Amino acid sequence: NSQLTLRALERGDLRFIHNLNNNRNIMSYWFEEPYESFDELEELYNKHIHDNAERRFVVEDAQKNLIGLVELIEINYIHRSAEFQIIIAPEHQGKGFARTLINRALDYSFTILNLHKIYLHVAVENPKAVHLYEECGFVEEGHLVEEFFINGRYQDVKRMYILQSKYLN
Amino acid sequence: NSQLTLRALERGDLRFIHNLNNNRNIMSYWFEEPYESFDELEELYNKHIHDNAERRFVVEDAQKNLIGLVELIEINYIHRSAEFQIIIAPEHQGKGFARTLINRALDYSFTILNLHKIYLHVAVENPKAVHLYEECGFVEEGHLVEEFFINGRYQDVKRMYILQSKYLN
Amino acid sequence: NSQLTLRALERGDLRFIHNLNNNRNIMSYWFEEPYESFDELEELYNKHIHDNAERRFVVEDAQKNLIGLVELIEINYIHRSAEFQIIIAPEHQGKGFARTLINRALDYSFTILNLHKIYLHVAVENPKAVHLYEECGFVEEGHLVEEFFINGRYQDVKRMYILQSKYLNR
Amino acid sequence: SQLTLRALERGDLRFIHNLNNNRNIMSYWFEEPYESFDELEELYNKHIHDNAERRFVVEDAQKNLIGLVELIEINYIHRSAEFQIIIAPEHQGKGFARTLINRALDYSFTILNLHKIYLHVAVENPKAVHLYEECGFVEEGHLVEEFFINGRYQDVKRMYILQSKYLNRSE
Amino acid sequence: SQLTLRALERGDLRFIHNLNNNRNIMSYWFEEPYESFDELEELYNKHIHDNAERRFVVEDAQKNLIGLVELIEINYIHRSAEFQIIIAPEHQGKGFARTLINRALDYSFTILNLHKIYLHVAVENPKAVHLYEECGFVEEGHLVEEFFINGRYQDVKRMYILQSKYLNRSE
Amino acid sequence: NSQLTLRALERGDLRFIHNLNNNRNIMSYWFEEPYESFDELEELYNKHIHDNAERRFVVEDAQKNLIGLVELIEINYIHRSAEFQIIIAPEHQGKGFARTLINRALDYSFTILNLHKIYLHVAVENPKAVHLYEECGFVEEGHLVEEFFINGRYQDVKRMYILQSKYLNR
Amino acid sequence: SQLTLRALERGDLRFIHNLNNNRNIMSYWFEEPYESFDELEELYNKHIHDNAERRFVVEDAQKNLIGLVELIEINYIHRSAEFQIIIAPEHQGKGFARTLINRALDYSFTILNLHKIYLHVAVENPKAVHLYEECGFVEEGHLVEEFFINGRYQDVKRMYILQSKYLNRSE
Amino acid sequence: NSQLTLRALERGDLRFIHNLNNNRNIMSYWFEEPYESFDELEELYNKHIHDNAERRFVVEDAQKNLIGLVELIEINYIHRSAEFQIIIAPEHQGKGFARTLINRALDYSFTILNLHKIYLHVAVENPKAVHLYEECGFVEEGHLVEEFFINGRYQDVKRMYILQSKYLNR
Amino acid sequence: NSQLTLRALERGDLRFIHNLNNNRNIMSYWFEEPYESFDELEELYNKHIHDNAERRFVVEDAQKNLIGLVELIEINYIHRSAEFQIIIAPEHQGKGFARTLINRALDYSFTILNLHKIYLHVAVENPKAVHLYEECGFVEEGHLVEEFFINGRYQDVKRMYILQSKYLNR
Amino acid sequence: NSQLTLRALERGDLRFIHNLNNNRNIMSYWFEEPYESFDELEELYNKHIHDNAERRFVVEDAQKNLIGLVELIEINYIHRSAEFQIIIAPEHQGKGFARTLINRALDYSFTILNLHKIYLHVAVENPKAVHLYEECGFVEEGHLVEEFFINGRYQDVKRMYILQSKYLN
Amino acid sequence: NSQLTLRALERGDLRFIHNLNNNRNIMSYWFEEPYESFDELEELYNKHIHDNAERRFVVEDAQKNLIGLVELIEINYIHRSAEFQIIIAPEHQGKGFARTLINRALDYSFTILNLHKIYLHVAVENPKAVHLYEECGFVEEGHLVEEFFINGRYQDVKRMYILQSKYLN
Amino acid sequence: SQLTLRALERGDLRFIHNLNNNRNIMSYWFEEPYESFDELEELYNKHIHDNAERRFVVEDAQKNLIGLVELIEINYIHRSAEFQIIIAPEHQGKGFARTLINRALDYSFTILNLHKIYLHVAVENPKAVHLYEECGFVEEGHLVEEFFINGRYQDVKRMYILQSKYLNRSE
Ligand SMILES: [Ca+2]
Ligand SMILES: [Ca+2]
Ligand SMILES: [Ca+2]
Ligand SMILES: [Ca+2]
Ligand SMILES: [Ca+2]
Ligand SMILES: [Ca+2]
Ligand SMILES: [Ca+2]
Ligand SMILES: [Ca+2]
């Protein structure tokens, strides 16, 4: 909660990323390229190394156990917005780490990158996640209908946002 | 209204595209690269010629006057969704062409590309456009707060959608 | 047709090809890449110029009017098979060129390329085309269910074939 | 439940190549014929970002390699693909086939969101034809002299199944 | 209103090069010094997709080329850039400068959404310093022997203006 | 062997190939490029890895001793022909592997690759080899005069062939 | 004497392609099959420095294009090549063939210094076989079902002639 | 320290550089490209190896402990100026190395590179650093307003300079 | 000059440059590569377009007649020195342009490029040229023995220099 | 004889070179690559433009008629030697130009390039050429046996040389 | 003498080649590029691996001691000629191996490569080498004057040749 | 005799770089300034086939690295080059300099066949000037404020020697 730190994703963390994907078992993307294998992930990482439109970070504890991933995509440097997500590894879920990770992502987004707005998508069928985000200051701005094909059907997601002025002021 | 046809954007239409951009006077993008000049537009067109994540079309009348542009971006072939917009050239605005263009874009999206969902953004301060889209069967799914910096301030947009099942059935 | 001739597609014929696509108004492919514009067609033609897995030909009359296109795709040089299609330009449809063009494509396929089998797909909802192909010696070997998304719905197609031995013994 | 599906990786190419020499017919990678491990490896590297074919390896709980699930000719507008499954000789006849087929359909219809999957089966392997029918595939073609296999042209059934049948048949 | 700003294009490079030979100091494109039209042209092509510098040409109603608006050192995290304006000798002293400066600020603050714009002006050109002050720029530095210009090191004022001042000063 | 098996040539077999060349001591070729060294062989293998006009295979016994090489070159996928050759390692010559290797090459050529014709060249001055090939079903179709410069003089070779239809009906 | 041989150039490719569509069999350039002028042109550019095949055009005094002389499979150790000649339909039967053949042998044996030239002729064209025999070629093979031509496998004679015969037969 | 030495940055020092970045926890740049990861740092080092517009050096003690980094950027070879910065590793801060490192950077700048002017930026809200630089001979030439977004707000920096003639005459 | 102007060499001036070379009839160099033909000159111009180690300028009169060439080579941006030469077109030799051109080159070198020193080589056997340079403020600093092979023998050259401080204080 | 000048071969002179080759009707080489066609000549010229191992020059009269070619090959800058030849166009043969061309080649070789030795090959069956070279100061240093296959047989050539010290002193 | 075999030069033999060069202490060439270092030799070997204009071979004894080098350069496949040399390592000189090496080079040249003529250069100041070559059937065809700068002065070489018809018949 | 000269190789670059940090002035490779081992290594690879500069390392009988012999600005028409020698600090003052200089002249004049070698020496190092004079070099220039070294512009002697003097002085 204090002992959780954020650091830039590196090539040796791609195994972790790929293990997070196998566990979630939906289609993953790197700069909009779908991938399933570690090999393609590795190559996409190398190919987009200088692209600033997406940024990834790993959260570790004091003993360097890998806790989760913080990802910003669709980063636009004129409108100053990005989409984010966090993924916590299954073994570390439900330990109360989520809030800390979310705060670390906002801190980076609003005190380093100088973004104006961050938004995220949450499955309407995960009301507890929606609630958590609301408790961290995110507000619903959309209920996107049949937005994503997940587990054999089109599902709705809340689009939730928070502004730099709310987070900092 | 019958005499308006849609055709694939070609290299000779980039002048038209660039004239549409100067008139609207906000930042334009090609596969997420911002551009201002015809030269950069031309080079981006050549570079992304085989990329299927965005598709553009020009609407012409019977005498080949250029009426406007139909653009799909963020095309995802797993979720089967895209973002669209239409831009009508200033001299052809207010002639009642908008509805026809919108129908041509939906027709392409849902009878050729086989998309599931199309969505678009409309400035909350253009309620007449919002109404028009509603009349063509689009439904509001989001009111995105301070989404875009336009004319010196952050503005809200409606996110409006329509599904293939509604359009076809 | 007697003076319909077949010739190898060239770069100056791509305009014709692209006009054939706009008229039929379904998604077209070049070596499996979908394309909509002349520019992308041109670039794909240049990129695949040395690829032998698809071969295209243009049919002209004695005054060099462009009648249509003969296309072989999915050419496999071990099993000696290919998929064929034809597109006749709108203005030349229904004039009785189709059978002649089909025979020219079979002739090339079976007397020059030395293929064993040619097959084609025809919309089940175009029974008169199916009949025509049957009259040219093709036989139904499948009725592919919801095979293609065409004009806003999944459509069935007949798969029809003919063998080299049948064509060469007629 | 014991059997899991995972994306093919470069270290699995040996397995793939061993499966090919056992079956002893001409193999293809993105339509290029190959016979050697070295050419397989090169084709794997060259087409790594191509989404028109996707391959997966099925392993048991101890990571024995059971077989291969392959989708080719994937078209994202018609939303169709051709599938096949190859089980390693030592694992044939243990009743793994139906589980592998279900894993391939699940991926095809719940992740890739395809509409139709089809496959080819030798008309001279009626037991395979039957198996596929039991997994919900239906014959849509009997292709005549389609493939030169073992010194003669052979017929294959073309069999298919639709997303709506796989996902909603029980509703 | 007569004066419009448009993105620099390849056909404007002649104009740019003529502006350089008139001013007769060393010119740069993405930090590469150049003296010839040919090198200018090559640098234009090479950096076409670089967003760290942006250039615009100002024309009148009859498309006479009036001048150049240039942003360099554009940083999209700090949201700052360096600006300059060059008016063609024949159009100097016609009162175009303030209009051009407003067009550059408008683009910088209403389209690019930058936070801060700054510029350098020769301390030995007090009338230019005054002009910039009248357009709302404020001195934040007097850089000592910053640039070797015409055979000696000269001082420049660094002047700035913020987005909030430009957009909201009248509110 | 009965347990002679054929497998696709791989990069780790190039040493064997190069040892076969030094032993025969004539100029060797890879896709028509002459080579003498292991290094050039290796580079040519890498360069032509995707070329289907030549195919090579190594024959091994049950304990993976390397017996020889089967090579198809000049493969033409329209006329459906190829030139074949065999090289048996010196230590395995005269043990009665040759006929088995020849049958394995024909089997691959006619049951997998679906070729129509295989032909080979044999030195006219090695009449016992010519006889062997005749006993395996090859027939002389030419006696090529001063065809190859080999060991300091131009030598004649028989060109011998066999057809798919003959092999598959035996 | 009227007829001269000159190296094929890029402007002659149209002629070459017209010769191919007239003969209506599959043509090759460095073993790549081609059917179109565009692919011919690309193959010409790609193999420009390859010495394994050499082509020449025969013209009359007014630069009418008479035909093509082609050497392929040129091997500079065995000192052999395969030859063919194609005369344009309008110039066939004018008695040019023997002159062209002599020009090809002259080049092959007095400039390239080859040892052996051979050619293939359809066994069903006995008059061509005779012509070649009259120019000093000798049958060394009757290749059985060598080429699929016009819907069936056909036999060809392989005919040859040696440098020593061509140069010294009269000595 | 007397035995603090300056040496050219090498690829094996990038780990140190990256550890210095994580500790300071602001956005770092290499030839104007922002980077956060070791991997991107490494790639930018390789890409700009021949670029002379920035030069970097590592300061070590007699036992080769890494003390800090000296960086010159925006080097202009006509006006003969550069921007300098220093980063001292956390464990070596406050030990009285800073002034020695500054003098080593000035020495290199003015006795080897032959620059005319060096300038640097210091946070206005770190007045003790400003004072230190003044004691080393730097003079304030600007107070740049809201120059940098650092830790969630725009901050002012002093721009401080010193000339070759001053340093070489001290 | 009074209306002699200096402008950056461009690609359309290479013909002039090449005509200057044929007239002087010694081996010419571009970034140390010897060249004799227009074509090689053109290719070297394209290849070194971004190289700052040599800079060239053309001198024109008011009607744009081409008078000559000013060349700086071996430009070193640390020691701040360069080698200069001038070539006047034959038809404009002896008209009293030389001194004006020399002053234009020095002006550029010392007021724009901010160099410290310019030096040049002059044939010892052209004492009137040596004198001219001395009158323009250059001083002999060496007499290089058998420095250059020119017209069939090794020739001596004076090396002459002038410093920025001298030029800017005149 | 005074009015004949030497200039560096250029791309527009390749037609002339190729016409000289068709007339001589033996195998020609460019940096050891055999060529027969103008197209291959052109490409070899472009490819070896920066190679200093061979140098070519054209001799023209006052009206820019092309008289012939001066070629140096096998140029070695350590031993300071090269092989030369001259070819005069058929229409200009026998006008007494040969001597002038030879002197221009020696002048270039020994006063510009600073070579030590130049040598050339002359067919033993062209004794008048051999004599001419001897009159220009070349000396026989070899009678190379069956050196070149020319017109259907191996022929002998004289190798003739001259040194810079002889030419200049 | 029977136990000496010839094999194609490989990359692992470049050390040997480079040691032979340091010992002879004159300028060495690879496809006409001068080189002094092992690194440049290695790179030239890689660059010209497919070039057939020069061919090299190593002579080994039964225990694979490296005896020497056989080199053919200037190989012309129309005239069917090449220049050769042999270099024996200092420790193996004067053991009577020279004759065997020369015969192996001729055998390769005339029974495998099918050349017509081989020639070599021998320093006029090494009359014993000249004699040896004469004993192996080579004949003097030239005495090249001041041909090579060696040890600080220009030296003469005999050019010696032998024909395929002499060697084989 | 103990001291031998050999071509610089990639494994000697560490030595070269150590010689540079000891001398503590700006070093160059084919006119590119460098300070790091990594840039040195890259420049070595990039210019490996460039003959305009040549470097050699001098070793003793036990392969201790003594120093470096460098020729730059090598021009093969004028037949000149610039030379320098750097002896490692630990081997200075052992009397190796003259031997190294003779080895450099020997290579320059007996292998490369150059006409003239010249070098630059600090006018403030009169003992080096003397040494070079004793090895037969003659002053041909006193270059004024030629190099900025240790914070000021310094003069250098330019010294030369000709091939004919080195080879024939004793004749
Ligand atoms: Ca992928
Ligand atoms: Ca841009
Ligand atoms: Ca293959
Ligand atoms: Ca420049
Ligand atoms: Ca082809
Ligand atoms: Ca050639
Ligand atoms: Ca070299
Ligand atoms: Ca550098």
Mapping DSSP to helix (H, G, I), strand (E, B) and coil, where does residue E145 land? strand
* K133, two tokens: 């070559």
| Beta carbons of G66 and G6 less than 8 angstroms apart | no
Residue D61: phi and psi, rounded to 5, are -60, -35
**Between vectors from CA E121 to CA E117 and to CA E124, what angle results, nearest 5°?**
165
| Beta carbons of H16 and H30 less than 8 angstroms apart | no
Distance from residue G33's CA to the centre of ligand 5 (Å)? 5
**What does the alpha-carbon distance between residue F13 and residue F20 come to, in Å, rounded to a whole number?**
11
**What does the alpha-carbon distance between residue J119 and residue J139 come to, in Å, rounded to a whole number?**
9
Burial (CB count <10 Å: 0-12, 13-18, 19+), residue L2: exposed
Q: Kind of pairing, strands J117-123 and J81-88?
A: parallel
Burial C121-137 (b: 16+ CB within 10 A, else e): bbebeeeebbeebeeeb
Q: E strands along J20-169, which residues?
A: 28-30, 33-35, 55-60, 66-76, 81-88, 117-123, 139-150, 153-163
| Beta carbons of C59 and C5 less than 8 angstroms apart | yes
Q: How many helices (H) and strands (E) does chain L have?
A: 5, 9
Q: How many CB pairs (< 8 A) connect I and J? A: 31
CA distance C75 to chain G (A): 14
**What does the alpha-carbon distance between residue G85 and residue G97 come to, in Å, rounded to a whole number?**
8
Indicate which ligand has the atom closest to the C-alpha of B31: 2
Burial (CB count <10 Å: 0-12, 13-18, 19+), residue L23: exposed
For residue E17, what is the nearest residue in chain I, using CA coordinates? I8
**What does the alpha-carbon distance between residue K79 and residue G110 come to, in Å, rounded to a whole number?**
11
Enumerate residues 6+ apart whose C-beta is below 8 A from B87: B20, B24, B68, B69, B71
User: What are the chain D neighbours of F47 within 8 Å (beta carbons)?
Assistant: none
Residue H96 burial (CB count, 10 A) = 7
Nearest CA among K21, I44, K19, K42 for reference residue L45 = K42
Distance from residue L43's CA to the centre of ligand 8 (Å)? 9
Nearest CA among F111, F98, F129 for reference residue F4 = F98
Chains contacting A (3+ CB pairs below 8 angstroms): B, D, E, H
For residue I116, what is the nearest residue in chain E, using CA coordinates? E151
Burial (CB count <10 Å: 0-12, 13-18, 19+), residue I62: exposed
Q: Which amino acid makes up residue B17?
A: I
Q: How far is CA E148 from the centre of its chain?
A: 19
Q: E strands along chain E, which residues?
A: 4-7, 27-29, 32-34, 54-59, 65-75, 80-87, 116-122, 138-149, 152-162
Distance from residue D96's CA to the centre of ligand 8 (Å)? 62
**What does the alpha-carbon distance between residue F68 and residue F72 come to, in Å, rounded to a whole number?**
14
Q: At what angle do helices E126-134 and E97-110 cross, to 10 degrees?
A: 50
For residue J22, what is the nearest residue in chain G, using CA coordinates? G6
Residue D126: phi and psi, rounded to 5, are -60, -25
Nearest CA among B5, B3, B10 for reference residue B104 = B5
* K56, two tokens: 């090299």
* I40, two tokens: 């090689």
Enumerate residues 6+ apart whose C-beta is below 8 A from B104: B4, B5, B6, B57, B59, B70
Write down the CATH number for the domain with range B1-169: 3.40.630.30
* A154, two tokens: 């089109």
Q: Residue I68's beta-bridge partner residues?
A: I59, I88
**What does the alpha-carbon distance between residue G107 and residue G102 come to, in Å, rounded to a whole number?**
9
K102 is in an annotated binding site: no
CA distance L158 to chain K (A): 25
Residue C114 burial (CB count, 10 A) = 22
I40 and J55 within 8 Å at the Cβ level: the answer is: no
**What does the alpha-carbon distance between residue I52 and residue A167 come to, in Å, rounded to a whole number?**
50
**What does the alpha-carbon distance between residue E119 and residue H144 come to, in Å, rounded to a whole number?**
12
Indicate which ligand has the atom closest to the C-alpha of D47: 1
Nearest CA among E47, C46, J27 for reference residue G36 = C46
Nearest CA among G21, K127, K107, A52 for reference residue C108 = G21
Enumerate residues 6+ apart whose C-beta is below 8 A from H92: H65, H67, H68
CA distance G130 to chain J (A): 27
User: What are the chain I neighbours of J50 within 8 Å (beta carbons)?
Assistant: 33, 40, 43-44
Q: Kind of pairing, strands K5-8 and J153-163?
A: unpaired
| Beta carbons of G58 and G96 less than 8 angstroms apart | yes
Nearest CA among J96, E36, K135, K150 for reference residue I48 = E36
For residue G158, what is the nearest residue in chain F, using CA coordinates? F142
User: What are the chain B neighbours of A27 within 8 Å (beta carbons)?
Assistant: 78
Nearest CA among B3, B4, B32, B29 for reference residue B17 = B29
User: For an interface test with L, which of H47, H114, H170 has the most L Cβ atoms less than 10 Å from its Cβ?
Assistant: H114
Q: Residue L55's beta-bridge partner residues?
A: L70
Q: E strands along chain A, which residues?
A: 5-8, 28-30, 33-35, 55-60, 66-76, 81-88, 117-123, 139-150, 153-163
CA distance I12 to chain H (A): 28
CA distance E137 to chain H (A): 12
* L102, two tokens: 């003779």
Distance from residue D13's CA to the centre of ligand 1 (Å)? 18
C34 and B50 within 8 Å at the Cβ level: the answer is: no
* A63, two tokens: 């003993």
Q: Which amino acid makes up residue D158?
A: R
Nearest CA among F61, A106, A115, J15 for reference residue E113 = A115
Q: Given H119, H133, H161, H167, which residue is catalytic?
A: H133
User: What are the sequence ranges of the domains in chain B?
Assistant: 1-169
Q: Kind of pairing, strands D80-87 and D65-75?
A: antiparallel
I40 is in an annotated binding site: yes
* H37, two tokens: 């990861």
Q: Is I133 annotated in the active site?
A: yes
Q: Residue J83's beta-bridge partner residues?
A: J73, J119
Residue K146: phi and psi, rounded to 5, are 50, 45
Tell me how far apart the 2 most distant CA atoms of chain I are, in Å. 44
Give the active site residues of K: 133
* Whole-number Cα distances in Å, B63 to B60, B67, C37, L167: 8, 11, 20, 89
Q: Residue H119's beta-bridge partner residues?
A: H83, H161
**What does the alpha-carbon distance between residue G95 and residue G87 come to, in Å, rounded to a whole number?**
11
Burial I68-102 (b: 16+ CB within 10 A, else e): bbbbbbebbbbbbbbbbebbbbeebeeeebbeebb
**Between vectors from CA G61 to CA G60 and to CA G66, what angle results, nearest 5°?**
10
**What does the alpha-carbon distance between residue A147 and residue A159 come to, in Å, rounded to a whole number?**
11
Q: How many helices (H) and strands (E) does chain F have?
A: 5, 9
**What does the alpha-carbon distance between residue G142 and residue F119 come to, in Å, rounded to a whole number?**
13
**What does the alpha-carbon distance between residue G14 and residue G36 come to, in Å, rounded to a whole number?**
10
User: What are the chain I neighbours of L158 within 8 Å (beta carbons)?
Assistant: 142, 144
Give the active site residues of L: 132
| Beta carbons of B14 and B66 less than 8 angstroms apart | no
| Beta carbons of F152 and K168 less than 8 angstroms apart | yes
In this complex, does chain H touch chain G, defined as having at least 3 beta-carbon pairs under 8 Å apart? no
Distance from residue A11's CA to the centre of ligand 1 (Å)? 18
Q: Kind of pairing, strands C81-88 and C117-123?
A: parallel
**Between vectors from CA J21 to CA J19 and to CA J25, what angle results, nearest 5°?**
120
User: What are the chain G neighbours of J34 within 8 Å (beta carbons)?
Assistant: 51
Alpha helices in A3-126 (DSSP H): 14-24, 38-47, 98-111
Nearest CA among L22, L21, L12 for reference residue L44 = L12
Nearest CA among D119, D75, D123 for reference residue D97 = D119
* L15, two tokens: 């030595």
J20 is in an annotated binding site: no
End-to-end CA distance of chain I: 20
Assign domain D1-171 one CATH number from 3.40.50.2300, 3.40.50.300, 3.40.1710.10, 3.40.630.30: 3.40.630.30
Mapping DSSP to helix (H, G, I), strand (E, B) and coil, where does residue G103 land? helix
**Fold of the domain spanning H1-170:** Aminopeptidase (3.40.630)
* F3, two tokens: 């347990």
* Whole-number Cα distances in Å, B140 to B128, B156, B161, B168, C85: 14, 13, 7, 19, 44
K125 is in an annotated binding site: no
Burial (CB count <10 Å: 0-12, 13-18, 19+), residue D113: buried
For residue J109, what is the nearest residue in chain L, using CA coordinates? L77
* Whole-number Cα distances in Å, F96 to D1, F65, F99: 52, 15, 7
